[PDB]
Structure 1
Amino acid sequence: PKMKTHKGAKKRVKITASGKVVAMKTGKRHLNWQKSGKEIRQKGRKFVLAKPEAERIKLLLPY
Structure 2
Amino acid sequence: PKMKTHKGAKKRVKITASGKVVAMKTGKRHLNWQKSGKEIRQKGRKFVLAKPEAERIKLLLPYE
TM-score using structure 2 length: 0.70
Q: In the comparison of the two structures, how many residue pairs are matched?
A: 63
Unaligned runs of 5+ in 1: none
| Contact 1:21–1:52 (CA under 8 A) maintained in structure 2 | no
More helix per residue: 2
Instruction: Give percent identity, aligned residues only.
Output: 100
TM-score normalised by structure 1 residue count:
0.71
Structure 1 residues 38 and 47, CA gap change in structure 2 (3 angstroms): closer
Displaced runs of 4 or more, over 3 A = 44-63
Aligned-residue Cα RMSD (Å) equals: 2.8
Q: Which has more strand, going by share of residues? A: 2
